[PDB]
Structure 1
Amino acid sequence: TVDLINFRNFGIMAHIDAGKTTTSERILFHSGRIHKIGETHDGESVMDWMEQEKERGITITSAATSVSWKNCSLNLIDTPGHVDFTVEVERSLRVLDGAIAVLDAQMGVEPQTETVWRQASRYEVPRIIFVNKMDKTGANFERSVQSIQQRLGVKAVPIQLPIGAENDFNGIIDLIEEKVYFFDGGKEEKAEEKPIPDQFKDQVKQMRAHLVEEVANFDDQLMADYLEGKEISIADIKRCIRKGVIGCQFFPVLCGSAFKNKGIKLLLDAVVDFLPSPVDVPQAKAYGEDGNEVLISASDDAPFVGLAFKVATDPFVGRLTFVRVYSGVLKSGSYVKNVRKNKKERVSRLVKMHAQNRNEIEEIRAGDICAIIGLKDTTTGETLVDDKIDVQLEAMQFAQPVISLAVEPKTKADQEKMSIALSKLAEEDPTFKTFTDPETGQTIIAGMGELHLDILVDRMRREFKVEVNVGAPQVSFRETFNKESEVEGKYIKQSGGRGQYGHVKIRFEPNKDKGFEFVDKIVGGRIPREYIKPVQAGLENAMASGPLAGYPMIDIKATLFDGSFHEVDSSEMAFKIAASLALKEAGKVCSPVLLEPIMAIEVTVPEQYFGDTMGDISSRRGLIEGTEQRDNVQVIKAKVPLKEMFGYATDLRSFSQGRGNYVMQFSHYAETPKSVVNEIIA
């Protein structure tokens, strides 16, 4: 590569309903503050649609957001927009070098910002903190600066101080420099340099007496200066905070309002000064396919390694493979290798996107993002190589589509077109599972939540032009029967040209913990041994149908007692049919019953949803017994019917504000109560 010290790439990570569209638009505008063509005023003149935060925030720009700031090219990316579905977030995280976590201002809960921060801290990647709105009701500075430590305790350092409380918001009291007033209520153009207000000088000093003190964990000379009271150079403490944030020792917090556009220039200055470069970030290594498969890093000079993470179809030129090249330098018109598929891919052309425009750069260096036209066979989750060597892949995706829904094809041709839509929609994110049940028949497709299923439907009907009916998930039952009985089977019949006859006598007995079992009682030669085995099969096929809803009958012990083999009219399949008649007749006599699937669900909650889950299980269904008291949490295991999971994924999640989790494991089939007997039957 060239100048890897400057190829600092970042990701746009915004909270749900925290102005995702708004915050993303302001980040584009400030990143768009390059006056070579007028991108500043061009972004200033944008007023877009308002349907959903994530959707409009994504569709306003392209995923690849290549911009520059005064020395360095930055590739901002906002692919994740969701209830914070994990895979896109972590994939972008491995693509990005650093990230900004947007805090919620309408309320103080911000239940999903803590989740994205958990995911970010999981990878040791550096981050920064910034409250989205300093003008929204409920956006209290004290609330945020106390809640961060109460919920997480990450030693976040609040650097800059605002001026006003959600109505009087008019500037920032800068800590590193003098005060900066922002009279703009939007569309940031000028910053008013002012001296620090007198009444808050001490407000600085204390924090100042802490700030250097907060970076006092790096050297002893800083402590000596603190004892002396001698001021440390602002550049020195700035670099100390940079080392802290890149090393995840602490994280700075800044203030501003997206709807008011105040103090984001300060954020950009901080990003340039303190956020890391690929040389400054740790080495998140990949994995090969041989058994030990890696003792290597990117090395960033000329081994070309780049993770294939997203593809989008431009109508003019076909597919577009967006890739962040981790190492090496690549040109166009060259065949790259995919060892996961062992295939050649010709790089027809290269392209870079800023907001929506194409820039054909014939060469891409390490530490950048780009898109490729060509490469019509590669999917996401893979790593691209051109040296004919096995690919090293770094993938730790988290797939939790805990809810599934059945999508109903209107026709077998509709089934085929929906499978084509599945092929299109699985290349972007295959975490969703699809099953075509052999018994229930309806196609089950997994999703995260209401918005996830909604967006899948939107791509199906609009992006894919595929129209398919939607239904309800399908996993039905099992059948068995009550107390034993013994009947006979006599099939004297014929269909095709001659006589046929057969007759057997069997015992129809339940076996609670054993499947099909055969016991013979032929002592007087009523049935030759040749007919012992076929009759068993006649039983094994007869249980498949039930008189209530038609599920196979299991947990039955069969005991053949007697029979009659006649002359040429007798044949083995006639005995099998007679045994089938006997089995069905006895099943009708012995009052068949049904069994429902039962999953064992374990829920671990600190304190919040104890009574909520108790009442949900008691009201809906399930088998429960009291409490488990784990180290600092409450754990409840319930053996609950699998039907009860319908909407439970969002009944628990809605009550938990998105902070719920569980484990779904199938336990066993259990007797169906009379209510279930009335519901399912037609």
Structure 2
Amino acid sequence: ARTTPIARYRNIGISAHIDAGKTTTTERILFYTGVNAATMDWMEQEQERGITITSAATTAFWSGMAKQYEPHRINIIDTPGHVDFTIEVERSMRVLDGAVMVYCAVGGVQPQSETVWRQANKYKVPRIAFVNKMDRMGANFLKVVNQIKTRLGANPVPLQLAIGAEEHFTGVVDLVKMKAINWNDADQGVTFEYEDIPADMVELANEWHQNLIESAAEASEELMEKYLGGEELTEAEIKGALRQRVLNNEIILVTCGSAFKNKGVQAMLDAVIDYLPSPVDVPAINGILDDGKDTPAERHASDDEPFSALAFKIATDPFVGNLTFFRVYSGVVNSGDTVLNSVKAARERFGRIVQMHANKREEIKEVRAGDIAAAIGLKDVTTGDTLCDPDAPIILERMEFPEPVISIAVEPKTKADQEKMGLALGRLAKEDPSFRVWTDEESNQTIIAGMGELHLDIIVDRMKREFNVEANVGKPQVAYRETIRQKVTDVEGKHAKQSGGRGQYGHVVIDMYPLEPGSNPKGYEFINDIKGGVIPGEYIPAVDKGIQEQLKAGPLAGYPVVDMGIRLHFGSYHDVDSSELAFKLAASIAFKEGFKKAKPVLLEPIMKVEVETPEENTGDVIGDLSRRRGMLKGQESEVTGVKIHAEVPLSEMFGYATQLRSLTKGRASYTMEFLKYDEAPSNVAQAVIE
């Protein structure tokens, strides 16, 4: 139909380390914006544990705390802290335009601040900053500001200053408008009296970081040329100045406050509209055409463009069915327009539409570009898919899928539930791509995988709650192998079945000898070094088949036999009685006894393991790799971390992620894949007895 405000849109997501208030702070908004509060942790579990598990989107209208503004429409997304659910930030930053990075007045940057930082950079998303909890013991605004500079290698710009600290935290200083903002006693926020700087800070206040104003200066030289020429810059041209540079992410404005005392959150909202983008202050989207090739999909942020949106986040509400959240980058969709899932090559027909609206699932018939909402009833739209105009098809960028770091095998407690465990794990997969499930090609047990111990925990817990399948968990099994160590000299097999029927007799003499990991496909070598004709070459295929059979699960403990070679040398037959079968058994017998005398051993699988860790704790990490019965092989010192290279056994890497984290303060990727089989240490071997 018509629309209304448009381009006064603020798509911002709040994200930070755990605690921090990245949620408390979000509820505070809904109070301030909702003058005249729907808890943002509304999952049952995420209330029980008191932690944000899933990204939660609402919208509300901020006229600016002073009345100062033409009403702006803000889309907020409170993201999880934690790792475990980092997926909830990839998506929650790919799609939206602005970002309010929260920091604990007490807790410095801290590890998961760095990770969300990298995710913001991954997507070059503009951002300001809000140092929460100024009222807490050990509060120190400027210290943290400095850590953003030091630890995050970024350019902070204190857009504000704190009036005192901890229990003596009474207000803040807008050091643009150069007044000491005063929030009052009751009514939480609202009200003001905009008091001037106190005698305490006038010295500090007469900074701004003059390289605020000198930071604003650096927008354009003709903007600073008058600054060099000592011309005090107009309030209006500064806000534009540093905003110009916020948008170009060369600067992070810091605001600070305390959600609890209600002293600070509001000034921060203003900073949003002041210095965080509109959906038009934005690079148009990149993308592809279908089969054909590139071209940036482009699609300007315009109502009158062809529709194009990305699907982030899938859910299922028990009353309306599937909810599919999207961000419309271009064009428009009307309830009934049949858009296209380009990345699945099927079309979908839009139906009812819902915007989560501070506290009510308000209904919509049209959704314009620059906005977000959830589409009810869409059939097969997974996370990352693009919904574009069928006449103007395009694939969009699609964020990235964090890739699990932990695996654990699960069994359905009640054998009955085994079917249902299948159904449920499937559902949780299409909701969380950072979660994965499969069935071990060998030792067929159900294996799930996630970004960590806690991730895994609440998934399994989610099964009980939503699918009523409880299942206990265990260490994944390991695929062992078998071989011999000594070449064993001419061993003898023989059949001779005078019983009553087919004559049948075969006799064979062979040498069994270990190999080295040779020729990919085989790992097995049969040699026809038979004499001139002690056994006819027609039966020679059979003797090979007979050995072949014994390799499927060797004599030590089932488990395939590998790296074995065999040489024919001698035998004997009847002119008639001997047969394919006869020598097939003879070989079978020849394999045994030969294997017994050949010093057999139990093999175990090893991984090429690659740990990526900071300089600070490459000591602990090495030692642990060693503790884990591991061999090390290199170190690079690749840029900032230090890649460590090692060969470490599988049955020994289980739950690495969990501890690797503990040893490196959360900052340490790693990766592994199969490399080889080596002898298992005895106590291992004799343990592995079925």
| TM-score, scaled to structure 2 | 0.90
Matched AA of 1:153 = G
When residues 248 and 593 of structure 1 are mapped into structure 2, their CA distance, relative to the original with a 3 A threshold, is same
Determine whether 1:7 maps to 2:4: no
Aligned to 1:196: 197
| Alignment check: 8 A CA contact 1:511 1:555 kept | yes
Matched AA of 1:589 = K
Mapped to 1, the partners of 2:84 and 2:159 lie a distance apart of 28
For residue 306 of structure 2, the aligned residue among 303, 322, 325 is: 303
Determine whether 1:68 maps to 2:76: no
Matched AA of 1:537 = K
Residue deviations 1:459-482 (CA, integer Å, cap 9, x gap) = 222122223231112233221112
The offset of 1:52, in angstroms, is 5.4
Aligned to 1:241: 242
| Alignment check: 8 A CA contact 2:323 2:374 kept | yes
| Alignment check: 8 A CA contact 2:609 2:670 kept | yes
When residues 490 and 62 of structure 1 are mapped into structure 2, their CA distance, relative to the original with a 3 A threshold, is closer
The offset of 1:590, in angstroms, is 1.6
Mapped to 2, the partners of 1:328 and 1:496 lie a distance apart of 87
Residue deviations 1:513-541 (CA, integer Å, cap 9, x gap) = 33322223433533111111121121122
Matched AA of 2:495 = Y
For residue 655 of structure 1, the aligned residue among 663, 673, 690 is: 663
User: What is the number of residues matched between the two proteins?
Assistant: 673
Residue deviations 1:283-339 (CA, integer Å, cap 9, x gap) = 231234425233331223231111122222122222121111111111112322223
Structure 1 residues 27-426: aligned runs within 5 Å? 27-30=29-32, 33-35=33-35, 38=36, 42=37, 56=50, 58=52, 63-70=56-63, 71-83=71-83, 85-177=85-177, 178-184=179-185, 187-207=188-208, 209-299=210-300, 300=302, 301-410=304-413, 414-426=417-429
| Alignment check: 8 A CA contact 2:531 2:569 kept | no
The offset of 1:570, in angstroms, is 3.2
Aligned to 2:66: none
Structure 1 residues 591-606: aligned runs within 5 Å? 591-606=599-614
Mapped to 2, the partners of 1:163 and 1:51 lie a distance apart of 38
| Alignment check: 8 A CA contact 2:482 2:554 kept | yes
Mapped to 1, the partners of 2:77 and 2:628 lie a distance apart of 43
Aligned to 2:632: 624
Aligned to 1:546: 554
When residues 402 and 417 of structure 1 are mapped into structure 2, their CA distance, relative to the original with a 3 A threshold, is same
Residue deviations 1:262-288 (CA, integer Å, cap 9, x gap) = 211101111112211111022231234
| Alignment check: 8 A CA contact 2:604 2:678 kept | yes
Mapped to 2, the partners of 1:47 and 1:674 lie a distance apart of 52
For residue 24 of structure 2, the aligned residue among 1, 4, 22 is: 22
Worse-matched range after superposition: 654-663 or 20-29: 20-29
For residue 469 of structure 1, the aligned residue among 464, 469, 472 is: 472
Worse-matched range after superposition: 516-525 or 609-618: 516-525
| Alignment check: 8 A CA contact 2:15 2:80 kept | yes
| Alignment check: 8 A CA contact 2:55 2:92 kept | no
Matched AA of 1:314 = D
Matched AA of 1:511 = L
| Alignment check: 8 A CA contact 1:62 1:355 kept | no
When residues 9 and 630 of structure 1 are mapped into structure 2, their CA distance, relative to the original with a 3 A threshold, is closer
SS of the equivalent of 1:207 reads coil
Matched AA of 1:115 = T
When residues 135 and 567 of structure 1 are mapped into structure 2, their CA distance, relative to the original with a 3 A threshold, is farther
Matched AA of 2:606 = I
Structure 1 residues 411-490: aligned runs within 5 Å? 414-485=417-488, 486-490=490-494
Please list every run of 5 or more consecutive structure 2 residues that lacks an aligned counterpart in the other structure: 64-70
Q: CA RMSD in A?
A: 2.8
SS of the equivalent of 1:379 reads coil
| Alignment check: 8 A CA contact 2:611 2:644 kept | yes
The offset of 1:430, in angstroms, is 2.6
The offset of 1:342, in angstroms, is 2.7
| Alignment check: 8 A CA contact 1:50 1:56 kept | no
Mapped to 2, the partners of 1:54 and 1:385 lie a distance apart of 39
Q: Percent identity?
A: 54
| Alignment check: 8 A CA contact 2:306 2:392 kept | no
Aligned to 2:68: none
Aligned to 1:532: 540
When residues 184 and 288 of structure 1 are mapped into structure 2, their CA distance, relative to the original with a 3 A threshold, is farther
Residue deviations 1:554-586 (CA, integer Å, cap 9, x gap) = 111101122333365533123212212221221
When residues 82 and 479 of structure 1 are mapped into structure 2, their CA distance, relative to the original with a 3 A threshold, is same
Worse-matched range after superposition: 629-638 or 430-439: 629-638
| Alignment check: 8 A CA contact 1:501 1:574 kept | yes
| Alignment check: 8 A CA contact 2:149 2:156 kept | yes
For residue 512 of structure 1, the aligned residue among 508, 512, 516 is: 516
Mapped to 1, the partners of 2:346 and 2:614 lie a distance apart of 49
Please list every run of 5 or more consecutive structure 1 residues that lacks an aligned counterpart in the other structure: none
Aligned to 1:613: 621
When residues 2 and 569 of structure 1 are mapped into structure 2, their CA distance, relative to the original with a 3 A threshold, is farther
The offset of 1:492, in angstroms, is 4.5
Determine whether 1:667 maps to 2:675: yes
Mapped to 1, the partners of 2:419 and 2:498 lie a distance apart of 42
Mapped to 1, the partners of 2:131 and 2:684 lie a distance apart of 51
